[PDB]
Coordinates of C-alpha atoms in Angstrom, one line a residue:
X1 CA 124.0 142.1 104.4
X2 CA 126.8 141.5 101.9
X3 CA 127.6 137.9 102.6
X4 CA 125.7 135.5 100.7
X5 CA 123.5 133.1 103.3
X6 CA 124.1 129.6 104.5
X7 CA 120.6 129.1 104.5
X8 CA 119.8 130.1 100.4
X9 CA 123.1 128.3 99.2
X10 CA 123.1 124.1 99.6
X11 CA 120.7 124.3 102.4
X12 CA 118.8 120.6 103.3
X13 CA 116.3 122.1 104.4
X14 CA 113.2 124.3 103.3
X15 CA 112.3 127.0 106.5
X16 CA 108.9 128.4 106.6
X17 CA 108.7 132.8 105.8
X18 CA 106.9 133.1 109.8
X19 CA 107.8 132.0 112.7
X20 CA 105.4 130.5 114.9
X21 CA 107.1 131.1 118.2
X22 CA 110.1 133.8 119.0
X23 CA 111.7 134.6 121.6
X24 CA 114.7 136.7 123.0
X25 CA 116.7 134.2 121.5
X26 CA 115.3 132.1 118.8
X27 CA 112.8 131.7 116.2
X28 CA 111.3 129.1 116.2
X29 CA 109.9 127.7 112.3
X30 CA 108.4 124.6 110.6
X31 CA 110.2 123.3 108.1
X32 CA 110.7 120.4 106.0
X33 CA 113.9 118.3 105.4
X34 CA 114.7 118.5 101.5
X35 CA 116.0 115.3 100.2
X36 CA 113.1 113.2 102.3
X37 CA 110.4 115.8 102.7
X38 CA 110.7 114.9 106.7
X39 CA 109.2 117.7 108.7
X40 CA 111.3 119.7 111.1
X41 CA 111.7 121.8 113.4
X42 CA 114.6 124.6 112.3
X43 CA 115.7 126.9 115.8
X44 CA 117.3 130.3 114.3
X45 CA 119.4 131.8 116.8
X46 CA 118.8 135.8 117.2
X47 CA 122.7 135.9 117.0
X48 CA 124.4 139.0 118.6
X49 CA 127.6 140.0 119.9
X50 CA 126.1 139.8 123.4
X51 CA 124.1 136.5 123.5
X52 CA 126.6 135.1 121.4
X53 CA 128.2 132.8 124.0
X54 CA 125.0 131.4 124.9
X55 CA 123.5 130.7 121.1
X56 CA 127.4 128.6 120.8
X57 CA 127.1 126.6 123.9
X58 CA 123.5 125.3 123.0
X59 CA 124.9 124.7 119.4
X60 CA 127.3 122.6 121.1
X61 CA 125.4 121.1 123.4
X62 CA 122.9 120.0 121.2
X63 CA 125.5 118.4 118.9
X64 CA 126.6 116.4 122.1
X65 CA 124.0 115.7 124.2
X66 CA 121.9 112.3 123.0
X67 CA 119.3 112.6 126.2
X68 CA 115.9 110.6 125.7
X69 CA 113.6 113.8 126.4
X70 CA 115.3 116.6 124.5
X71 CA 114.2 118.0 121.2
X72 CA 115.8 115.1 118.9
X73 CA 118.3 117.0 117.2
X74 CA 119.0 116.3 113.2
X75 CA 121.7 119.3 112.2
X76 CA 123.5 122.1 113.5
X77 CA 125.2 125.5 111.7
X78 CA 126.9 128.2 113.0
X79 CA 129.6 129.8 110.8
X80 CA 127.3 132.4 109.7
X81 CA 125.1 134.3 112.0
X82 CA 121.7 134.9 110.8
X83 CA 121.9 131.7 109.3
X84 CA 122.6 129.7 113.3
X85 CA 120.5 126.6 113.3
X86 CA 119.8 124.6 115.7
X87 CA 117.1 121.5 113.3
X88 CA 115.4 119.1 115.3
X89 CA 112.5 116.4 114.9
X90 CA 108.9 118.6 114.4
X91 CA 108.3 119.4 117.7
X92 CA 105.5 121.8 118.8
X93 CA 105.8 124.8 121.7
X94 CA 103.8 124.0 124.7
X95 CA 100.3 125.5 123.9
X96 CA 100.2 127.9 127.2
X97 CA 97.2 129.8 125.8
X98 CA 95.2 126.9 126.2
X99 CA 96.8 125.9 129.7
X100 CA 92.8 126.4 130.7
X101 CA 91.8 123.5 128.6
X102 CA 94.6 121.0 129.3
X103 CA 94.3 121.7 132.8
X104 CA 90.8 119.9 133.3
X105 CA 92.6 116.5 132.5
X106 CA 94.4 116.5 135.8
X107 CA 96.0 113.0 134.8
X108 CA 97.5 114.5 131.8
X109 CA 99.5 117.6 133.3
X110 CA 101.1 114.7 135.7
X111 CA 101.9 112.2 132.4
X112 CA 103.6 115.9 130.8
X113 CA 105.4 116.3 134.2
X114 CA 106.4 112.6 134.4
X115 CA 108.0 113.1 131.0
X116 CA 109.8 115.8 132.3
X117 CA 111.3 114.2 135.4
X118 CA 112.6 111.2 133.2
X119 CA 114.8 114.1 130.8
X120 CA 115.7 115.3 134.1
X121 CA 116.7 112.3 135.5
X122 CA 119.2 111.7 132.6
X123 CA 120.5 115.3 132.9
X124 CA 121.2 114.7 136.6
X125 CA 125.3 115.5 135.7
X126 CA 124.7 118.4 134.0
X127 CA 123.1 121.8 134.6
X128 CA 120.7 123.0 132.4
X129 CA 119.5 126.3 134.2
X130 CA 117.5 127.8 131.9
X131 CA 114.0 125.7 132.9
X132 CA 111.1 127.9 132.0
X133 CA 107.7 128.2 130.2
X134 CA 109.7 129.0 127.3
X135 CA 111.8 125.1 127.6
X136 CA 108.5 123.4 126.8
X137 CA 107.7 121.5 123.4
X138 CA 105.2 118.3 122.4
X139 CA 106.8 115.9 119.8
X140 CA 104.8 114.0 117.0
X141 CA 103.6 111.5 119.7
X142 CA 102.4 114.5 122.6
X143 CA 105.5 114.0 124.5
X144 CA 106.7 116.6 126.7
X145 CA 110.2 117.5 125.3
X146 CA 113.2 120.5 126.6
X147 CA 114.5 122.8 124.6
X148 CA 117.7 125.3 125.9
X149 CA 120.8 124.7 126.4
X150 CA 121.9 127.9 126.2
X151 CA 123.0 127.3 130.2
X152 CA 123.8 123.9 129.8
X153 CA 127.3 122.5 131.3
X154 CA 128.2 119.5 133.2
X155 CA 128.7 119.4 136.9
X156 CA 132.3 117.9 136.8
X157 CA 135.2 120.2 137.7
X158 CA 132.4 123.0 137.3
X159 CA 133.0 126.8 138.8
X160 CA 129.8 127.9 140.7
X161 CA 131.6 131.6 139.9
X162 CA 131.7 130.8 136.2
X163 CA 128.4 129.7 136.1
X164 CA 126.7 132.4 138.2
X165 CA 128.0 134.8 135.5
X166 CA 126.4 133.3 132.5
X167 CA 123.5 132.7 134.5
X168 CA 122.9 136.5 134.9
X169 CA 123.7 137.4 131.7
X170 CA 121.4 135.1 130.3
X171 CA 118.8 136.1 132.6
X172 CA 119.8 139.5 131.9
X173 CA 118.8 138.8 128.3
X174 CA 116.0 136.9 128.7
X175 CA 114.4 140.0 131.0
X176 CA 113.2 137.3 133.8
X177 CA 114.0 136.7 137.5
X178 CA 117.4 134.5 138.0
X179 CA 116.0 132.0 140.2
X180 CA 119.4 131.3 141.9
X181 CA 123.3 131.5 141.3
X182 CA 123.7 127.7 143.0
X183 CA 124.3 125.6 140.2
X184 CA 123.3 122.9 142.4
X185 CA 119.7 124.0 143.2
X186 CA 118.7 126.6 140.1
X187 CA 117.5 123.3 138.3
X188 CA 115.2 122.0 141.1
X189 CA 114.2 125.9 141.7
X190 CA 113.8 125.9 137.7
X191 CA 111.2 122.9 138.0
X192 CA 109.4 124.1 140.8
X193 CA 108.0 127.4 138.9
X194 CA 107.3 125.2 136.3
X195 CA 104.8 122.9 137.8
X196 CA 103.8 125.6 139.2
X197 CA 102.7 127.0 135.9
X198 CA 101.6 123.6 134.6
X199 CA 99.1 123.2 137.8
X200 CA 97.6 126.0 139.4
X201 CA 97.7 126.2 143.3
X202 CA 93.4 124.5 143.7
X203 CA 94.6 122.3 141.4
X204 CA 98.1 120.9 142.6
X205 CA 97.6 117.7 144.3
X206 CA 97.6 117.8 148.4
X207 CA 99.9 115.3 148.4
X208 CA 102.2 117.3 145.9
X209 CA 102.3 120.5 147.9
X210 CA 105.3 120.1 150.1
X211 CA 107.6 118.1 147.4
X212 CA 106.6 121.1 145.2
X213 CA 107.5 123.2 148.0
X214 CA 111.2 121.9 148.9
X215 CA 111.7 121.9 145.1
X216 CA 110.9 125.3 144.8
X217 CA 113.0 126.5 147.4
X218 CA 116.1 124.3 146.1
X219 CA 116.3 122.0 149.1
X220 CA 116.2 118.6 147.5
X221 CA 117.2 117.4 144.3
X222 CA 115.3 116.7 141.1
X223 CA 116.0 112.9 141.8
X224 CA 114.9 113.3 145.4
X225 CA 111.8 114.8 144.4
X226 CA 111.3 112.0 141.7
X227 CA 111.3 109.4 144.2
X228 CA 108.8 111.1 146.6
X229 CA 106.3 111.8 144.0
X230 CA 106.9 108.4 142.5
X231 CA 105.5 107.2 145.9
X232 CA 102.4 109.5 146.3
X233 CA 99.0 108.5 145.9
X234 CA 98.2 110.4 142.9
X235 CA 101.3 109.3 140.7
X236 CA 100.0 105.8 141.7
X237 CA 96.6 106.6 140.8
X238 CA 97.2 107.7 137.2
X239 CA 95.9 105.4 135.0
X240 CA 97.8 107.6 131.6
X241 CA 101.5 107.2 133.8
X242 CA 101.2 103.7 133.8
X243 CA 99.2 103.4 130.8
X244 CA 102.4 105.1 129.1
X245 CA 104.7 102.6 130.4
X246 CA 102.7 99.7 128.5
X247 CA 102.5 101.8 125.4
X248 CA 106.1 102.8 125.3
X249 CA 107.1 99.3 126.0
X250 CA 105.0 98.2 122.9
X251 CA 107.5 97.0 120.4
X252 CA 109.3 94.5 123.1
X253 CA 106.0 92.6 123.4
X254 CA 105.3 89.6 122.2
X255 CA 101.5 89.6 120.0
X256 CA 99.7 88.4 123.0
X257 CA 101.6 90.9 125.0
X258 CA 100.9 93.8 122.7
X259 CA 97.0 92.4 122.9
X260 CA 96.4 92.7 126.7
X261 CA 98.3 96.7 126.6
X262 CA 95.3 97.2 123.7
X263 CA 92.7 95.6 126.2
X264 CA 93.9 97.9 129.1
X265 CA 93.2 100.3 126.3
X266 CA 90.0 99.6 125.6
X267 CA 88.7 98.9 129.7
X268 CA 90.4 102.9 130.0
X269 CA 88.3 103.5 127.5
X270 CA 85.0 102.2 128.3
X271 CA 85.5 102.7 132.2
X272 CA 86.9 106.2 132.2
X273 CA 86.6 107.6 128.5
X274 CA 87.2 111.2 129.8
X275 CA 90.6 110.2 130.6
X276 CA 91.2 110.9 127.0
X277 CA 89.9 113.9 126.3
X278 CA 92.1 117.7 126.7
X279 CA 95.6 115.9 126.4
X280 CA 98.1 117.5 124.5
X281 CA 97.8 116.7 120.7
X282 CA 100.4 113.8 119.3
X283 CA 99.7 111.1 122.1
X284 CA 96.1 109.9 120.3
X285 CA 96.5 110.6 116.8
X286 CA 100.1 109.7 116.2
X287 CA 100.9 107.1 118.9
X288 CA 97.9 105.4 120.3
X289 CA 95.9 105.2 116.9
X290 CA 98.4 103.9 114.5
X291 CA 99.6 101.0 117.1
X292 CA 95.9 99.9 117.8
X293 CA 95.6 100.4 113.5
X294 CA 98.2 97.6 113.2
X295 CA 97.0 95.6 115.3
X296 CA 93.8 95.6 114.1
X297 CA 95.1 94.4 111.2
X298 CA 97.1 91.6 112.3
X299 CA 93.5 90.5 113.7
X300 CA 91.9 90.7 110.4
X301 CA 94.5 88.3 109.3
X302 CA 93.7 85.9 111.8
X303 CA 90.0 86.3 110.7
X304 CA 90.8 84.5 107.4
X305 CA 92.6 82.1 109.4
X306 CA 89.3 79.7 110.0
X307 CA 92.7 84.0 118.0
X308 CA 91.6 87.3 119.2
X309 CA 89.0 87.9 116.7
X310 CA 86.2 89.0 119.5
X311 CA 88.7 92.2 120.0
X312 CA 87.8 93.2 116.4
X313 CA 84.4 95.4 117.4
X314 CA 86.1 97.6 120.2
X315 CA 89.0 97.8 118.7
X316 CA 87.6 99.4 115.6
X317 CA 85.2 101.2 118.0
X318 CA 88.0 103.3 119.5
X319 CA 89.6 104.2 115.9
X320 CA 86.7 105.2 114.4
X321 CA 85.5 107.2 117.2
X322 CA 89.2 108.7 118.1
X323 CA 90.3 109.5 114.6
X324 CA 86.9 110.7 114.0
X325 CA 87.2 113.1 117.2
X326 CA 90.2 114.4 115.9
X327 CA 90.1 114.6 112.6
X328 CA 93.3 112.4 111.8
X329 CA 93.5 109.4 110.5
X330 CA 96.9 107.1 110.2
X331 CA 98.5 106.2 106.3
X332 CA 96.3 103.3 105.3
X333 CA 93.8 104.2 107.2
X334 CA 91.9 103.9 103.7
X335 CA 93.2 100.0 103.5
X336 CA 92.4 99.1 106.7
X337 CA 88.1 100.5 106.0
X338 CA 88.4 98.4 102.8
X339 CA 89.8 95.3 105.1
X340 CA 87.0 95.6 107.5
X341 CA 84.5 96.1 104.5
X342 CA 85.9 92.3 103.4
X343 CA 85.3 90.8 106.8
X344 CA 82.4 88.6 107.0
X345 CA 81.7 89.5 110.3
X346 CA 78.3 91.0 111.1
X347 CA 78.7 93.2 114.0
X348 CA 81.8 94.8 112.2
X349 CA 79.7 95.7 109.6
X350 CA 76.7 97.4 111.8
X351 CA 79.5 99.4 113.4
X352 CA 80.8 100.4 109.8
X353 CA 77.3 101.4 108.6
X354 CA 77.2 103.2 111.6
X355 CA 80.4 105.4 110.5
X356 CA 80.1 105.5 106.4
X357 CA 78.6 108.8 106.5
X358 CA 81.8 110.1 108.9
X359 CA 84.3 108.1 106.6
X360 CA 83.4 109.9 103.0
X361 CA 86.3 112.4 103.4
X362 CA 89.1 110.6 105.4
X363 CA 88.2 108.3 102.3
X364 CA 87.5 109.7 98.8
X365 CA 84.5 109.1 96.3
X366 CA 86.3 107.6 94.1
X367 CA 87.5 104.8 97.0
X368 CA 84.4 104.3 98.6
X369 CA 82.4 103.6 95.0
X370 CA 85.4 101.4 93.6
X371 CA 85.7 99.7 97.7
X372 CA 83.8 100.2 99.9
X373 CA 80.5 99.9 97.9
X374 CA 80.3 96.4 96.1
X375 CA 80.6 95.0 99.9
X376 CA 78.6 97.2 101.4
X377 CA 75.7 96.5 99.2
X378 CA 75.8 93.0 99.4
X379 CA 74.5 93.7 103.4
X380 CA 71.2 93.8 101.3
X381 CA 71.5 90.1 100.7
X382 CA 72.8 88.8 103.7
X383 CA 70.2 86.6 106.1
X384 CA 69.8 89.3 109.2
X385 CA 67.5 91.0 108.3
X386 CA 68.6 94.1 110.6
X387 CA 71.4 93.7 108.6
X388 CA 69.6 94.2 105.8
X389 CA 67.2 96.9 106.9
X390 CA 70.6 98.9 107.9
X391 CA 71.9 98.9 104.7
X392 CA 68.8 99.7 102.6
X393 CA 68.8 102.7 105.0
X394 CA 72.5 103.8 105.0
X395 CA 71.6 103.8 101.4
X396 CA 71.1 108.1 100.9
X397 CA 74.4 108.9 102.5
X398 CA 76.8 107.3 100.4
X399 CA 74.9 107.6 96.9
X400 CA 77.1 110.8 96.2
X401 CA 79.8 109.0 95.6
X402 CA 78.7 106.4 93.0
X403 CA 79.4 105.4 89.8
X404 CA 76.8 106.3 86.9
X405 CA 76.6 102.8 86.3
X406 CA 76.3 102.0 90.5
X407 CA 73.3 104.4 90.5
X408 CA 71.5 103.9 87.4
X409 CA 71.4 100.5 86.6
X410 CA 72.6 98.2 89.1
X411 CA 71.1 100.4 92.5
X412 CA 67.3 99.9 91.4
X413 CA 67.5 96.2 90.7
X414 CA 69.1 95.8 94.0
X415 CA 65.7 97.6 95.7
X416 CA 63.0 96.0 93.2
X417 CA 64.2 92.7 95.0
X418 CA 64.3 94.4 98.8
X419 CA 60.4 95.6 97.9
X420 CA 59.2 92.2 98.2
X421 CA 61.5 91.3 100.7
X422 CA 60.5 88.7 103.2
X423 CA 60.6 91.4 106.5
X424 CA 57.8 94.1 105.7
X425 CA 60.3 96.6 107.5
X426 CA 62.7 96.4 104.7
X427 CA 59.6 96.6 102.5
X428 CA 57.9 99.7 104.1
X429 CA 61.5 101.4 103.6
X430 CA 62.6 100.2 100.3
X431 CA 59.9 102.6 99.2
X432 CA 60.6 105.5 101.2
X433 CA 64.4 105.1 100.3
X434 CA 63.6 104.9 96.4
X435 CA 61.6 108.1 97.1
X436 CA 64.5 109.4 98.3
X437 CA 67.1 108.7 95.7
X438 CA 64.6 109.2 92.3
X439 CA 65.6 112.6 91.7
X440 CA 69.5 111.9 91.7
X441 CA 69.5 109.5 89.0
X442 CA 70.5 110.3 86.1
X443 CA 67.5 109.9 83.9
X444 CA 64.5 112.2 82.1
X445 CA 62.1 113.2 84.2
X446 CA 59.9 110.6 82.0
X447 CA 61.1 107.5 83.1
X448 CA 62.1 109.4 87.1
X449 CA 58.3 108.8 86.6
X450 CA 58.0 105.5 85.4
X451 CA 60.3 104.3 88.6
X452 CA 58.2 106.2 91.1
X453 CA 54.5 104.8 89.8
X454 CA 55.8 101.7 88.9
X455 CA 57.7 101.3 93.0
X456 CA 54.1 102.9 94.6
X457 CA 51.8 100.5 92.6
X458 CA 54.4 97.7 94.1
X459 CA 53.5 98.8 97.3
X460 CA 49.9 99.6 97.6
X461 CA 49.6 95.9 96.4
X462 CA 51.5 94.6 99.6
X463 CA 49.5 92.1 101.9
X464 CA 50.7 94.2 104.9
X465 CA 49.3 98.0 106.0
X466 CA 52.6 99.3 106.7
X467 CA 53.9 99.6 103.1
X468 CA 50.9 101.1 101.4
X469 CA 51.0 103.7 104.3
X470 CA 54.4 104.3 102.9
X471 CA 53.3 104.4 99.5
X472 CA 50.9 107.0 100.2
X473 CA 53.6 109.1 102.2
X474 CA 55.7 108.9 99.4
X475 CA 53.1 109.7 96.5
X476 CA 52.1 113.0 99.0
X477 CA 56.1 113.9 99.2
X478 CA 56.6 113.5 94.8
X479 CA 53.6 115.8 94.0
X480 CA 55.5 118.2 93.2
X481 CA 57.7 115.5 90.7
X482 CA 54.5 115.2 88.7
X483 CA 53.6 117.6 86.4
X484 CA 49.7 117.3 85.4
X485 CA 50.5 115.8 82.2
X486 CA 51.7 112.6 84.1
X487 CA 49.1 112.7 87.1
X488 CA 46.6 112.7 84.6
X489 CA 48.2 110.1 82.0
X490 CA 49.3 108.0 85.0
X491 CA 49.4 109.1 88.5
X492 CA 45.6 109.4 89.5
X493 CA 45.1 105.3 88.6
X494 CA 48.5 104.5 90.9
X495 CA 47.0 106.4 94.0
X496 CA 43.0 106.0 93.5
X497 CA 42.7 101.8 94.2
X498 CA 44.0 102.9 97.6
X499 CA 40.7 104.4 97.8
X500 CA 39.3 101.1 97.9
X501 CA 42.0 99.2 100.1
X502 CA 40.5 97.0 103.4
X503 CA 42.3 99.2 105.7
X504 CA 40.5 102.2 107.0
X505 CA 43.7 104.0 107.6
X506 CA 44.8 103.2 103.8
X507 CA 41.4 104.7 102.4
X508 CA 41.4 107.5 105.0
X509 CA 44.8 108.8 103.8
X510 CA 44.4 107.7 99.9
X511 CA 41.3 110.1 99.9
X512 CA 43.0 113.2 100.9
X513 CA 46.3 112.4 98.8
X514 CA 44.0 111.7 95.8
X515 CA 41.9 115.0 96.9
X516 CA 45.1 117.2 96.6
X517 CA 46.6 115.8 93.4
X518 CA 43.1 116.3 91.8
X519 CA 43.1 119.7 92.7
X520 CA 46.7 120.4 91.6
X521 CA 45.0 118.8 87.9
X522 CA 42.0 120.8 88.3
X523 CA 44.0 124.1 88.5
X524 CA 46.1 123.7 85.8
X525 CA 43.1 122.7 83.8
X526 CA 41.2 125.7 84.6
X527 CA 44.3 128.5 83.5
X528 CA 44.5 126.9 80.0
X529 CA 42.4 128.9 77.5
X530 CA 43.7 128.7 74.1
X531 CA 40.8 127.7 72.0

């Protein structure tokens, strides 16, 4: 081509080299709007001198049309072909090749096809004729949203003859089955296939079949249908429909209003947590996360204010489970971890320890060391001891991301002081977890051995059974951490008064420890022979 391209000269936005969906007569690509970095959507019309009517009416019609349910459109172009846009919010094609999956959450399928029916219901004066698999997109928030218009004209002083002939020739193009020249009933005849696709016939509801039915064979209109279906049992039954009504209603609510649609949240969740599980992407991550996000953090506010502070647990629950699950997490996710870290709440914290490990990532090293770390220690100090006990051993997951200082210096005085803590728990596993962690700090293997006999001597000193026994475990576990040179310097006078102890179970297992680190001395003894 000869003439220089829209699309490379003063363009707002960038378009992605593949499309992720084509068809007969668009691409379909990701893009990004330039001046804000807002993703998009960018339509590029397969422009020809045949479809060329149809690609200038849906130009036109998505200039005009402002219907809640559409692709949101940002920008159109058309005076050059090959560079015909159509740019709308990101939106995302229906995933049909994973129909199978989103199928076995029967409630979300209806919630799509409710979202459908409302875009239909504000298209009720115009025609839009060109209902297929092909219409179907998810926005940002997993709303069901139409692309098409193509077809689309209003009913008002409208030629059924005109129509009929576009119709054809669009169908014609598109290499599909004209569903019906009556401008009247091709929409209702449009949905019926549709739903069809959506829900196969074993898993249509019973009390959908004839509605379905009448659509399908263009005998009642797409409002008529609404109302019938809006009466059945199942639309009644479906906790996401109405659950969707709350949610989209959100921002009208006052707090305590907002509060109770987060409590239906939460009974949903707990009573029928399947519910969600296979919907289609957007709905969790980017509408039902973020809202519960905020107002979490309005409640952590109120926290400091000594409201709905016993909300604080669940609430936290579902995010950290949800966002884990998919792995998305909302801007300031990161703040709102550090917020909770603050709170002085205990049963927060035992559901943060629970889901440290899970948050290095969504959070970086860097964040959890400088804070998340300085509070989460302090769970050492604090007067539960479960607490306590579940934070000494949460201890190994997040030493990656320490500090040199963190580690080395201030890490062991915290455990010299939980060794001779007053619950012999926390003492039995102080020892185990300084096992552990001795061979990631950063010292010689000299003093790596000064902090192991001097924790194990500690131990096998303690008035109860359980902590030598741990000793011992851990003194069988570092043999290898010992070269001969320090068994024999050191190690055999740390493990032989255990020999000794009042226990039977201590001097039954300090006799075969000692056994085996005397033979790893004798061996090494025997192969020297320099004179």
């Amino acid at each position: 081509p000869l003439h220089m391209s829209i699309s490379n000269f003063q363009f707002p936005y960038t378009i992605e080299e593949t499309a992720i969906t084509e068809t007969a007569l668009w691409q379909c690509f990701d893009g990004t709007r330039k001046a804000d970095s807002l993703p998009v959507t960018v339509f590029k019309a397969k422009r020809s001198p045949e479809n060329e009517s149809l690609i200038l009416n849906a130009v036109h019609k998505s200039k005009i049309l402002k219907i809640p349910g559409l692709c949101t459109v940002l920008e159109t172009f058309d005076s050059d072909p090959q560079s015909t846009f159509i740019v709308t919010e990101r939106v995302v094609p229906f995933p049909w090749d994973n129909l199978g999956s989103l199928s076995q959450n029967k409630f979300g399928v209806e919630l799509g096809i409710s979202q459908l029916l409302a875009t239909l219901g504000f298209l009720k004066n115009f025609v839009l004729g060109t209902l297929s698999k092909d219409s179907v997109f998810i926005n940002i928030k997993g709303e069901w949203v139409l692309f098409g218009l193509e077809l689309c004209s209003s009913k008002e002083g409208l030629s059924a003859f005109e129509f009929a002939s576009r119709a054809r020739s669009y169908y014609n193009i598109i290499g599909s089955q004209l569903p019906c020249e009556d401008p009247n009933t091709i929409d209702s005849m449009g949905l019926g296939l549709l739903i069809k696709s959506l829900m196969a016939p074993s898993c249509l509801p019973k009390d959908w079949i004839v509605n379905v039915n009448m659509i399908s064979d263009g005998k009642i209109t797409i409002e008529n249908f609404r109302k019938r279906l809006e009466n059945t049992e199942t639309w009644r039954s479906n906790p996401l429909i109405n659950f969707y009504q709350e949610l989209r209603e959100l921002h009208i609510k006052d707090p305590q209003g907002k509060l109770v649609v987060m409590s239906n949240l939460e009974n949903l969740y707990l009573e029928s947590r399947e519910i969600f599980r296979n919907l289609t992407p957007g709905m969790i991550e980017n509408f039902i996360i973020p809202e519960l996000c905020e107002i979490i953090k309005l409640l952590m506010t109120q926290s400091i204010s000594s409201n709905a502070s016993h909300k604080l647990v669940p609430f936290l629950a579902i995010v950290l489970d949800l966002t884990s699950e998919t792995n998305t997490f909302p801007v300031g996710f990161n703040d709102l971890i550090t917020q909770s870290f603050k709170l002085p709440d205990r049963q927060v914290r035992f559901l943060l320890l629970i889901y440290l490990p899970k948050l290095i990532g969504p959070l970086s090293k860097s964040e959890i060391s400088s804070r998340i770390y300085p509070h989460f220690i302090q769970g050492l100090t604090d007067s539960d001891a479960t607490l306590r006990l579940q934070t000494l051993k949460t201890i190994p997951c997040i030493v990656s991301c320490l500090t040199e200082r963190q580690l080395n210096n201030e890490l062991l005085r915290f455990l010299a002081k939980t060794q001779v803590d007053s619950d012999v728990e926390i003492r039995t596993w102080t020892v185990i977890i300084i096992s552990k962690i001795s061979t990631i700090l950063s010292t010689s293997v000299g003093n790596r051995s000064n902090i192991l006999a001097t924790a194990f001597t500690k131990s096998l000193k303690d008035p109860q059974v359980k902590p030598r026994l741990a000793a011992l475990y851990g003194l069988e576990k570092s043999i290898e951490l010992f070269d001969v040179n320090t068994i024999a310097n050191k190690i055999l006078t740390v493990i032989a008064p255990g020999l000794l102890d009042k226990s039977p179970i201590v001097r039954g297992r300090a006799k075969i420890l000692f056994e085996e680190y005397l033979e790893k001395l004798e061996k090494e003894a025997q192969l020297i022979q320099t004179n």
